[PDB]
Amino acid sequence: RPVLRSVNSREPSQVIFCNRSPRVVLPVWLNFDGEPQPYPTLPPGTGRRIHSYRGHLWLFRDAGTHDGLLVNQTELFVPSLNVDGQPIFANITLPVYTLKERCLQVVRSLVKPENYRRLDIVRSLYEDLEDHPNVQKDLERLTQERIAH
């Protein structure tokens, strides 16, 4: 029903997740109803073979903070059929975050949420700190972006 969901192609596709980021990476599979399911995490510099399927949908996040990451320099990864038995590479990297978002990342990592409002900063930043990264907001944005085109 949702635009962004895995399709039950039942066509096997071998994939290699390669973490070329400095974060611990959480692979997230969008199931057939478009709901996120987590898979075991990947340390920096590590690669791992996965048995996935043509037309399944993946995204990749910081396992601890849920910051969004890039896969093959984009947001969503979709396996195709292997050619020559060669696995398909999903190379995970850091996006160029805005300076604001990167600062929010660092502050969030050092301040408990119940203490955001104890910080002596401009008031509008409180909501900014509290609007944590998360898969559902990104999927909304990507869905509208897929409609547009």
Partner: protein, 104 residues
Amino acid sequence: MDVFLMIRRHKTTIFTDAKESSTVFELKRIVEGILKRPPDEQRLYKDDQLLDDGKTLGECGFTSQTARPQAPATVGLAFRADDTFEALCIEPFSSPPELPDVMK
């Protein structure tokens, strides 16, 4: 590779980049274009070491590892007033505050 620099004199800081394979003299030419002083009125420094016009920046230790966009290397700059070079002087940036307790 490109190397990323801060050229610092007194309370002036130039952000710029150059090739590892370019020379100290070529960097003085960049400074000349920005601050309108010719190379012969400039001395460049890595820490307290005066840099020779003929050396490449790579040889002098400005590399992809030490001179990164997000963490550029510092080059000191001293000008010649009249017939005499000033001593190298770089004013420090301001002091960061203590972390609030809720960030500790």
